């Protein structure tokens, strides 16, 4: 017997937010880096990690030129960045919503190793999640993000890891959809190792199928859900070389065999690629001559901001130039969303 | 680790046959009625059930006018009809392939009641299936058909019935794809009872999701598979009345939430409807303003041939008129495949 | 391929602790009541809820006579009670271990309603659980407790609720076994409603089978795990009446069809029964003439302490008499563990 | 909601037959060899395979001395042997029931390779099984046998093979229990290869857990079911050497972690061992100092009859001596059932 999880108005908000995020030509900037990863990135660039530098760097990211207004539909933030204010006086969620963007927040509490596996981990962060999503919904967060990690090994991914990560993602998305927050499932598959297109494509199919079975099990309103997969790409130690067209064909085959078409949009990871390779691959994916009945766009953390961070270097007066650099990649990625990119 | 079930040439035959079957404007005639059901139908029309009458009736179905040549892409036969010859001397598979059609065969051995359930049955017919499909492949059968039955009850469909029927369908489709025969999965849901659009749509989602999970489990090459679902329609004792647009919206929602887009085509059942209601509903489904990234066509057993059987009546000299009647429905259903039908 | 979750020494501690807890004639006192439930219980008895009254009441429970030393193998505490000290100066974990008992702690963070179900809830409390169990292991907690809730309804328990609760229990038990803490799974089935012995026995089989499948999936060392089920008992509004022998037969049938015999012991709930009915039923269960290859004992929260709380009334000078009352039930329950109870 | 598969009288026959089969000190002779395997065995001994030689050899097996009357509780036959008569005039089922034995029949139709796996096969034989079991029940068969095969490889047994074989075994046992025939599940794991005690024990746990989950899913009355597992033994190419006590400890650990204690008895395979090694191992298993709450006995096809077949050689006049040889092993195996064997 059916007791509906959602009223039709709840489905209306989830569908409208998911359509406004993944709108044609728009993408996702992921400024959600925690203090450890951003500490590594500020230590590489050669500055001290303080709250002021992090706030100023996200100022450099967020208040860039109005040319990125038809580029970014939504920005993912850390928890701390929701309660930081810009030097103009405006809080960063209002900064995001003022230029048409949507506020999100990365909500997981890290990765926990699973017993008995070969280095396989699950994700943490389920306690207090309804109250926290209610609080973030009061502060203007309209979508969320959760990151599960899987690695390709000798006999990994085992069935235990895929089942547990799929069940956790479905539980998370149910809780987020209860509170009027569009969830984004991110089934990340680690690119480390040496494996061809074929095996990585294979485990991509198994992982995405288990995810969508668990989503059907937990009554998830799939019209208000976004998918964040990685491009099927060979391992870093894999010796074989492939054109970008084969990678695009393999991605659209791995999606067209799994993703049911009510899922509103597909946002890709960069996954340790270069700044240009991700845009080239996404432009290839948007040019693949099969029938792709959803939005195909980008959600790039490092691939948007890495070289702009390099051109910043920790000095304020370089800012505009660094900001200009960021805009460049954004504009390129916008073309990568519509297939009209050419390098 | 991946050991591929299919060579790329095997995928090439399966994809080419599935594309030739479900080709735009073409549909499936199901003349696969067994001796009991066709015995009931000949007893209703008032003639004796012999081999000669069955052969002559399928002669009346199969050698109709050449106007049905851009109508039927494929015909489903009983096992016996593959070894019957027409009075011209040509065997019925050659009759089918001569006018552009593709030979199929219904291969299941009936329904067996499941213990402990409330009148829920599974399907039979797995033994010797590889040899039988090899034999039918030698005789010109290029696709198959398997029919599982589920009924909507108080606490039915239980999880046991859906799991067992999905596993049996996947096992069947693996065996058929091994031998170069395109399988057609038919997840029939019984329209008996009293239930709204909502509950029947709900159990349609659960059943189709479990089916596609089991197909992903058994490495089924989904580009060479056809789907045969029923239209989500209220029960026969249900008191509420619905327009055909609501039924079309519910069907395309129940498909767009489940069917991955590599599945080549969707052929509907008639499911106890009238001869005109099925064509009206299919014309509505082909006019629904959502994105349907596959072929939507008909596979009508009774809805093609019932009134033509009525105009036959068991007398040979009425034949042409009866045949003319059949052509009428076929032409209508062809328009129901392309959305340009108007009654 | 097998990467063992546990070293053999880890299996040795888990087995030794589980054997010391469930030792023949010993049981579990559950003083783990949170502030809301104990607030309701102090408000019923007519005293104000303060930290001093809670500490003093658990003083009344814990420092009772030495006759309960061969009665209680282990005590379950709230988190707060681990950091309260007795008026002698000794902390309550040392109080427990001084008279032969083992310290436990209830670790879940409550129940969260599942979307789309009919009032079905999951359990919360997975974040930070490895660090918290390491901290409690430093403070002397050797076992844990987690409480999932399921209710018998019209079409409930659904498959979603049982699957999610089983996966959460297995994840919890893996985390606890990683840190050297013996987990106790508690699959509680709510006794509310009107349902016979038959349906409650049925859903007990389904729930326990799904739990043990998920435990086999997560590589749980079942020799170091305790099971906390409820006795299969009809609903509160059920009109049919049953002898205690039928309830004992149904419990031992529902366990002997599911529990694999390496699971070290089975501790029952009281589940809203009377103070005497639970002891009578447990004495019947220990007299059932089938082969029960494990320890069958009690884990009684209310059924040990309710009437002793009544004889306390919130006044200190009644203490000993109230404590004497507690000892009475404990002694009775000890006989209920060995089948030699007679009321 | 519960609709009981079995009336209590049906449970009474299943329990009584299962108790009479596995009765203390009794075992199972498996004369169920099909024409191919027995053709290989008659070709090794150097005689022509005819119906007369097969009938005469099973005469040599079945009408041995009355000292085997407290040895064999039941005999498994091929289908053909049920309709062969002895030279006295009595049919072989009456021969079996006259000396206290129970007639069984091997009912599967062989093994079929699964697509996409690495040499993994499922089992066949489900069609017409209710009618065939009704027919064998009329002829005096009171139990059955079904044999699924799994091999230990690099990345095998995969989850697909274990799931499919468990579902097929449960479906088979439901059908057999519907007709009043006690099923015997045989989850055979192939001993070929090189693998330690540890990995074979591991996959034994996974396989048996999946089997019992599928049996709980299909409402199987486990008091009327027998289990036929193999002893966990290293591979034929494995270099490490183990005492028989370690093999006995590993078997009783692999059973005590999985088998719920209502399953009436456990009958072992010989599995390519010597004639003496199987009896030594079973005597060790019956001497393992853990709590084994079921009957542990033998079901030996080759290990009972191989050397007796050797002492036959295809000549009639050696018969008695050959028969005497058979009795020897039987008597030894009877002691192997009670732990009082000493070689």
Numbering used by the authors:
A (entry chain B), B (entry chain A), C (entry chain D), D (entry chain C): 2 to 344
From the publication, what sentences describe this entry?
To test this, a cryo-EM data set for aldolase was collected at 200 keV using beam-image shift and analyzed. This analysis shows that the instrument beam tilt and particle motion initially limited the resolution to 4.9 Å. After particle polishing and iterative rounds of aberration correction in RELION, a 2.8 Å resolution structure could be obtained. This analysis demonstrates that software correction of microscope aberrations can provide a significant improvement in resolution at 200 keV.
Then, using these new beam-tilt values, we performed another round of 3D refinement. This new structure refined to a higher resolution at 3.6 Å and had a lower B factor (−202.0 Å2) [Fig. 4(c)], indicating that the per-particle quality has increased.
